[PDB]
């Protein structure tokens, strides 16, 4: 299918769109730390041509937006991230209800990383999308690092009680969990952790991993092929 | 797609086959254990489809063939299932060669439990398909239960030196285990013990697993769908 890039506004914000002719559902798709909504869409090939109407949009301090994003090396990483996703969060959550209203079609959530745990804080919250990709990622926020100062109480939080272990808010939404068997940003172990949290609250067959051995933290093209099809799966189906 | 279902002979077997109008690769998959060639393509829906010829012939002792097949009462049992793997793996090879030379498609392979461990074995011997899928299987046989007797030397060697052990003929085949967490038949932690045998021997990656949590030793419509992904994302490879 041939697509159109756009950009429309929904809930106040910027979203980069690749709208088909024949759309059969929306996909919003939250990016990584230090990413963007151009590099998301762009780790998402054949999705759009297939029907699927992407949208995507800066998380705070990233791409267009003010920075500057977080830094490794500052005391305050840790906490400036979470405030991101907190951020990234809430207006992911009012981008989905809008574009549903915008378009009226199902709607699916795909999140790379940072975006992956977003997409967790989403679910644990009540959002309801018709199925999730989380890709490069964990439902528990990163390792804490020796050295570092949190006192937000948002980031407290999250900390306290990580989205994933809020598996009965979660309403059996359909959950596909990609991940490299090499990855060093968030290790593999993290990714098992989050399915094996999730795994009492979930109906058989609605909550699977894939897992690509030797990858690293990158969302390959069979990651992407493979989260294709669970959508369309999930799209097809009862 | 029209997709028509025809009896073949292909190196002097009765091969069923699912062939679709416009085929463009060719996928060969092997039943397990009580199964039956017709058992294995019902379960790999839009398959056919999506363009691939599927054949399927049914292994010793079974379906169509004298029989019957192997008892788990048997104290022979185990010798008696490991001598139909290696017969079906003698009769697969020759079948594929066959059909490669016949309809020039890229081949596949898809083996589901005793099926997948039939794949390793050709693995093991240098065959080089495309792409193999091993549904709800392993590379490793069975563990050996109490009271059985094995004098069958070439079912010896298969436990001397099991096919996953011998990676570094795999020629880094792409190759993905599909399979249930829940599986008692073949524990999950055989698939894992699989994959960790051959993760040294797959330095480029190519080397995938997919786990439905909640799902157990049956070949399930989700596993269907990322194992056809799969597969086209490796025919697709330039």
Redesign the interface.
């Known amino acids: 299918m041939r697509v159109r890039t756009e950009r429309l506004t929904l809930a106040g914000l910027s979203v980069l769109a690749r709208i088909p002719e024949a759309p059969k559902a929306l996909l919003l798709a939250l990016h990584g730390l230090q990413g963007s909504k151009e590099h998301i869409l762009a780790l998402l090939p054949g999705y759009a041509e297939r029907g699927f109407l992407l949208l995507a949009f800066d998380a705070p301090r990233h791409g267009e937006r003010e920075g500057p994003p977080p830094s490794s090396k500052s005391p305050r990483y840790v906490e400036e991230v979470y405030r991101v996703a907190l951020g990234f969060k809430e207006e992911a959550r009012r981008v989905a209800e809008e574009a549903e209203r915008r378009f009226g079609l199902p709607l699916f959530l795909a999140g790379g990383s940072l975006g992956a745990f977003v997409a967790h804080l989403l679910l644990a919250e009540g959002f309801r999308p018709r199925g999730v990709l989380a890709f490069i990622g964990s439902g528990f926020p990163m390792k804490l690092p020796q050295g570092q100062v949190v006192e937000d109480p948002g980031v407290l939080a999250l900390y306290q009680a990580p989205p994933a272990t809020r598996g009965e808010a979660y309403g059996g939404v359909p959950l596909l969990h990609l991940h490299g068997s090499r990855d060093h940003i968030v290790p593999l172990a993290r990714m098992e952790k989050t399915?094996e949290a999730?795994?009492p609250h979930?109906?058989?067959?609605?909550?699977?991993?894939?897992?690509?051995?030797?990858?690293g933290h990158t969302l390959t093209?069979?990651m992407a092929?493979?989260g294709?099809?669970?959508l369309?799966?999930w799209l097809e189906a009862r």
Chains 1, 2 share one sequence.
């Open positions: 399915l999730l795994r979930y109906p058989e067959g609605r909550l699977a991993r894939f897992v690509e051995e030797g990858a093209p069979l092929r493979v294709l099809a669970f369309e799966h």
